[PDB]
Write a protein that binds this DNA or RNA. Structure first.
Ligand SMILES: Nc1nc2c(ncn2[C@@H]2O[C@H](COP(=O)(O)OP(=O)(O)CP(=O)(O)O)[C@@H](O)[C@H]2O)c(=O)[nH]1
Ligand SMILES: [Mg+2]
Ligand SMILES: [Mg+2]
Ligand SMILES: [Mg+2]
Ligand SMILES: [Mg+2]
Ligand SMILES: [Mg+2]
Ligand SMILES: [Mg+2]
Ligand SMILES: [Mg+2]
Ligand SMILES: [Mg+2]
Ligand SMILES: [Mg+2]
Ligand SMILES: [Mg+2]
Ligand SMILES: [Mg+2]
Ligand SMILES: [Mg+2]
Ligand SMILES: [Mg+2]
Ligand SMILES: [Mg+2]
Ligand SMILES: [Mg+2]
Ligand SMILES: [Mg+2]
Ligand SMILES: [Mg+2]
Ligand SMILES: [Mg+2]
Ligand SMILES: [Mg+2]
Ligand SMILES: [Mg+2]
Ligand SMILES: [Mg+2]
Ligand SMILES: [Mg+2]
Ligand SMILES: [Mg+2]
Ligand SMILES: [Mg+2]
Ligand SMILES: [Mg+2]
Ligand SMILES: [Mg+2]
Ligand SMILES: [Mg+2]
Ligand SMILES: [Mg+2]
Ligand SMILES: [Mg+2]
Ligand SMILES: [Mg+2]
Ligand SMILES: [Mg+2]
Ligand SMILES: [Mg+2]
Ligand SMILES: [Mg+2]
Ligand SMILES: [Mg+2]
Ligand SMILES: [Mg+2]
Ligand SMILES: [Mg+2]
Ligand SMILES: [Mg+2]
Ligand SMILES: [Mg+2]
Ligand SMILES: [Mg+2]
Ligand SMILES: [Mg+2]
Ligand SMILES: [Mg+2]
Ligand SMILES: [Mg+2]
Ligand SMILES: [Mg+2]
Ligand SMILES: [Mg+2]
Ligand SMILES: [Mg+2]
Ligand SMILES: [Mg+2]
Ligand SMILES: [Mg+2]
Ligand SMILES: [Mg+2]
Ligand SMILES: [Mg+2]
Ligand SMILES: [Mg+2]
Ligand SMILES: [Mg+2]
Ligand SMILES: [Mg+2]
Ligand SMILES: [Mg+2]
Lengths: 205, 369, 81
RNA sequence: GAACUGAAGAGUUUGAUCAUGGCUCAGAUUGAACGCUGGCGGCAGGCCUAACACAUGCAAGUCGAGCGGAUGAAGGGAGCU
RNA sequence: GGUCCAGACUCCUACGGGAGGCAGCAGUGGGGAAUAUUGGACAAUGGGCGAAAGCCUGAUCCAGCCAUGCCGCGUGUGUGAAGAAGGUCUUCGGAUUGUAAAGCACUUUAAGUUGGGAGGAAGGGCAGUAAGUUAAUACCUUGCUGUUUUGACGUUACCAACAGAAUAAGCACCGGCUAACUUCGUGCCAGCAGCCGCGGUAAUACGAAGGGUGCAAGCGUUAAUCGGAAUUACUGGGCGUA
């Protein structure tokens, strides 16, 4: 399945940016993002350790739009690997095909990139892949189907990716709308406020 | 893409079932309940804050306010199956179905036995018929389907359904005994079913005879002989001696002016359950009389609330077959339960739809029980 | 007798075969004394179509093992390559 | 060059406290069943109870190049036509 | 799925006389909370016989049914403040549902229709050719060549075109343990409950409504095993008064 519905409620509940709109105008002037959603928005209501762990895990899940069972799978495979499962989890989550397409800049949001992937418009190594979970390997050359390169959405999102901060680990050729995924980003490159140790503590229980 | 302020009124979609309340109707209309209450009071019948109203007024108020509406079918599955059930062409005459009715011991089983040369009357516990039987016979004039029914007053319901699928009734009355209560019951059943009646005075070989008081008795019951006004034909028979049976059969088949085109045999078959039972070795077995279409072996059939596909299909005397004509009685195997008499069977030719419709019916059947 | 035949693994519509030496009166997927290779009908990519251990095959042939028709064809196919 | 690397507590006896001690909860699993609800596909699984009684179909045959024998086409045709 | 003897239980009978063994595959009745089709083919892999064609094969390969499990994908995407109408609450100012809706613009995955389209196939028949076989260009065995012939699944996997947002969200919980709160009814009643326990006139615990929190084609309850339990303590407990 997939979460469909209001997307500014999640930002208000988590209390942070949690990029879910196109980012065109702003985030503050659409949802007054300083109250928790619902009737009792003004109450502060500090929360326990379990609440903090749950909020962190839910925040990560709500940013990539992954449900609970697939998150369990990702966590299990990350723990099975070597080298600090906490950062292996983000290493794994950054290699998803929809996330890669979003980073390359062919989609306004994660959901838009997911629909680009699902609707048979993205080819990974020169053949169509429509699974928004395909782990992109380093060196793969993602592209767009020639019959769909003149869609207004990709061109519109190209400049938005132009001004959002350089990722500096993928490359893109704009004329042919074709890019290369050099390598999965290091833990430093990602936002150093997602404290994954809370996730590890929550699941190891 | 900019934001434009709407100018005209707002219109919604209104979903109305069999019944609806004013509060919830207004809720779907995005309007207050007090305003619609006063609107109803101003035009026609006043309404309460929580008064249940029908489909017609709900659709009226939906259409006057301008919002689009659509009615909700409480039995959408049933009507969807019915509309998608069948449609064919062509028409071919079918063998007539005739039921036999009368008073006790007036000699109807003997009449059928002489017609078929079968003598089932020798069997039968106690000397009385207690089961409704259907036989397909090749008479010297043609093909007929006879239905023998018990004459006792305790099987009245069994007689009623017997008149539901006959279109012709042979009323046997004994010459010596005359009009008896079950004769009145049989004529009432025939009149209710809207069915032609052929009367046969039996036991004419007795020295008492007197086959003329029956004429007056049936005339007083609104059944007129061939003479006089003329509604039904009379004929004297002797059942055991077999005199007059030929003329009775010819008179019965003379009522072939009812055309009786059974539609194409190529249509999916329909029928009615006549006799359902349970067998320790083959499960629930249903004796059904085809009405039109054709029933084939290995066909998905929905009967009553039991569904299932026919593993096997026997005729009256065993000998498994693979076909069933427009008016042939057959015993089918393969249902998941024992149906009750009077239910209808239809070939669905689509297993899924049959399954959810049958489970649907079973569920409300448990709820109603 | 002792025969060399194919034991079917894999999955639905995707067969995989093991070259197996068995007593003849066993289930197709039951007891065996030795497996001496495999055969892949689909193969494709980096997979190999079939592989055979020459020494074991020759030893079992010299002991009187009777290959099946398909195995008889595959053995000389492998030898040719 | 790898074949492993891993261990949480809480509620409840008292006016309150520490200890002892039982009960209960948070996890992972089913050949599961039941209630409500139900779009698709891939791969698996499906009488755990009565080793209870079984209607009807099929599940073990092959060899005429071991042997008598009877059914013996196509034809060579002949004769009367 | 053979013989004989005896036994229990069914059945046929012309009344003298015989037959039977689904814990093989489908199937029935019964018992139960509960577990499926009287399906297709020997095309593939095996097995029996044959010399060879070939015959048999409920093994097997495949289909049917069932959210029973595991995995994957859909039920749209962007913009959109008069912060619409309605519902809910209120200190009557307003807040919330909420960019959520409507409007505007995009796309067609899956399902729907139509056209293309592999792989599972090794072999068999016929004719010629070359070697070996003897005593022999014969028959026969083997190589190769040429021709012909094989698929239940199957309307295969897959690929392409067409119209449109149209065809597709529910379940549990919200006093603490434990993430999530207020109103309205009821008054030791009706009820809830895993443990503490709530309910006797302002109930965040009962029943509804608004809001929220978890999961999601599933969600809960019941049954059962291990863990937590160092609570049978080898690792790793104790015995003055528990
Ligand atoms: N004299 C005479 N007797 C007859 C005639 N037909 C039948 N019977 C006798 O009447 C008796 C009853 O007849 P039957 O046919 O059994 O009557 P029924 O209508 O079947 C009785 P039920 O209503 O239970 O079915 C029988 O013994 C039969 O011998 C007839 O034509 N003449
Ligand atoms: Mg899932
Ligand atoms: Mg009778
Ligand atoms: Mg009597
Ligand atoms: Mg009398
Ligand atoms: Mg069934
Ligand atoms: Mg075995
Ligand atoms: Mg075994
Ligand atoms: Mg304790
Ligand atoms: Mg206390
Ligand atoms: Mg239950
Ligand atoms: Mg249910
Ligand atoms: Mg239900
Ligand atoms: Mg058993
Ligand atoms: Mg049993
Ligand atoms: Mg056979
Ligand atoms: Mg021989
Ligand atoms: Mg047996
Ligand atoms: Mg014996
Ligand atoms: Mg004996
Ligand atoms: Mg015996
Ligand atoms: Mg048995
Ligand atoms: Mg069985
Ligand atoms: Mg058993
Ligand atoms: Mg049963
Ligand atoms: Mg039962
Ligand atoms: Mg079940
Ligand atoms: Mg079974
Ligand atoms: Mg075979
Ligand atoms: Mg032969
Ligand atoms: Mg078969
Ligand atoms: Mg499934
Ligand atoms: Mg269920
Ligand atoms: Mg199951
Ligand atoms: Mg308002
Ligand atoms: Mg498609
Ligand atoms: Mg092929
Ligand atoms: Mg096609
Ligand atoms: Mg809390
Ligand atoms: Mg409750
Ligand atoms: Mg109150
Ligand atoms: Mg509670
Ligand atoms: Mg409550
Ligand atoms: Mg429940
Ligand atoms: Mg339980
Ligand atoms: Mg237990
Ligand atoms: Mg338990
Ligand atoms: Mg222990
Ligand atoms: Mg325990
Ligand atoms: Mg411990
Ligand atoms: Mg010790
Ligand atoms: Mg101790
Ligand atoms: Mg001591
Ligand atoms: Mg003491």
């Amino acid at each position: 399945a997939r979460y469909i519905g209001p997307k500014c409620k999640l930002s208000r509940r988590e209390g942070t940016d949690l990029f879910l709109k196109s980012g065109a105008r702003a985030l503050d002037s659409k949802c007054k993002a300083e109250n928790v959603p619902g009737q009792h928005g003004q109450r502060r209501g500090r929360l326990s350790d379990y609440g903090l762990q749950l909020r962190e895990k839910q925040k990560v899940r709500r940013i990539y739009g992954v449900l609970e069972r697939q998150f369990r799978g990702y966590y299990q495979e990350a723990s099975r690997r070597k080298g600090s499962t906490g950062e292996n989890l983000l290493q794994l989550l950054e290699c998803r095909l929809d996330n890669v397409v979003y980073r390359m800049g062919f989609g306004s949001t994660r959901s838009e990139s997911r629909q680009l992937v699902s609707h048979k418009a993205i080819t990974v190594n020169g053949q169509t892949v429509n699974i928004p979970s395909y782990q992109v390997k380093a060196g793969d050359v993602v592209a767009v189907r020639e019959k769909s390169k003149n869609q207004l959405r990709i061109a519109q999102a190209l400049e938005l990716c132009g001004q959002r901060g350089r990722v500096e680990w993928v490359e893109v050729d704009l004329d042919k709308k074709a890019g290369t995924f050099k390598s999965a980003p290091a833990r430093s490159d990602l936002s150093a406020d997602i404290n994954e140790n809370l996730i590890v503590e929550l699941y190891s229980k | 893409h900019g934001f434009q302020n709407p100018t005209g009124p707002i219109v919604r979609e209104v979903n109305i079932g069999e019944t609806i309340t004013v509060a919830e109707l207004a809720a779907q209309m995005s309007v207050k309940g007090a305003e619609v209450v006063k609107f109803m009071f101003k035009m026609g019948s006043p309404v309460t804050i929580n008064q249940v109203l029908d489909q017609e007024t709900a659709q009226l108020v939906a259409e006057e306010l301008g919002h689009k509406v659509k009615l909700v079918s409480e039995n959408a599955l049933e009507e969807q199956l019915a509309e998608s059930l069948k449609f064919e062409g062509e028409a071919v005459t079918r063998a007539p179905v005739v039921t036999v009715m009368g008073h006790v011991d007036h000699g109807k089983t003997s009449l059928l036995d002489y017609i078929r040369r079968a003598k089932v009357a020798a069997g039968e516990a106690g000397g009385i018929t207690q089961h409704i039987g259907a036989y397909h016979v090749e008479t010297e004039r043609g093909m007929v389907t006879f239905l023998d029914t018990p004459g006792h007053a305790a099987f009245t319901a069994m007689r009623a359904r017997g008149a539901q699928a006959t279109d012709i009734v042979i009323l046997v009355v004994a010459a010596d005994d005359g009009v008896m209560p079950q004769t009145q019951e049989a004529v009432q059943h025939a009149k209710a079913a809207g069915v032609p009646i052929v009367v046969a005075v039996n036991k004419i070989d007795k020295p008492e005879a007197n086959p003329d008081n029956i004429k007056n008795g049936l005339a007083a019951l609104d059944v007129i002989p061939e003479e006089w006004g003329g509604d039904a034909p009379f004929v004297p028979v002797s059942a055991k001696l077999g005199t007059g049976v030929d003329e009775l059969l010819e008179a019965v088949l003379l009522q072939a002016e009812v055309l009786e085109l059974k539609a194409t045999p190529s249509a999916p078959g329909r029928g009615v359950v006549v006799e359902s039972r349970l067998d320790k070795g083959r499960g629930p077995v249903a004796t059904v009389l085809v009405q039109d279409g054709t029933l084939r072996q290995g066909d998905m059939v929905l009967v009553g609330i039991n569904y299932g596909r026919v593993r096997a299909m026997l005729d009256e005397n065993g000998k498994p077959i693979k076909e069933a004509g427009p008016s042939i009685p057959v015993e089918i195997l393969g249902l998941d339960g024992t149906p009750d008499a009077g239910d209808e069977m239809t070939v669905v030719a689509d297993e899924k739809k049959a399954r959810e419709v049958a489970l649907f019916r079973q569920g409300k059947f448990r709820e109603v029980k | 007798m002792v025969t060399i035949r194919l034991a079917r693994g894999g999955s639905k519509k995707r067969p995989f075969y093991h070259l197996t030496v068995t007593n003849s009166r066993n289930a197709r997927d039951g007891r065996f004394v030795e497996r001496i290779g495999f055969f892949n009908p689909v193969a494709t990519g980096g997979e190999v179509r079939l592989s055979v251990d020459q020494e074991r095959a020759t030893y079992w042939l010299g002991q009187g093992a009777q290959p099946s028709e398909r195995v008889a064809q595959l053995l000389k196919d492998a030898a040719k390559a």
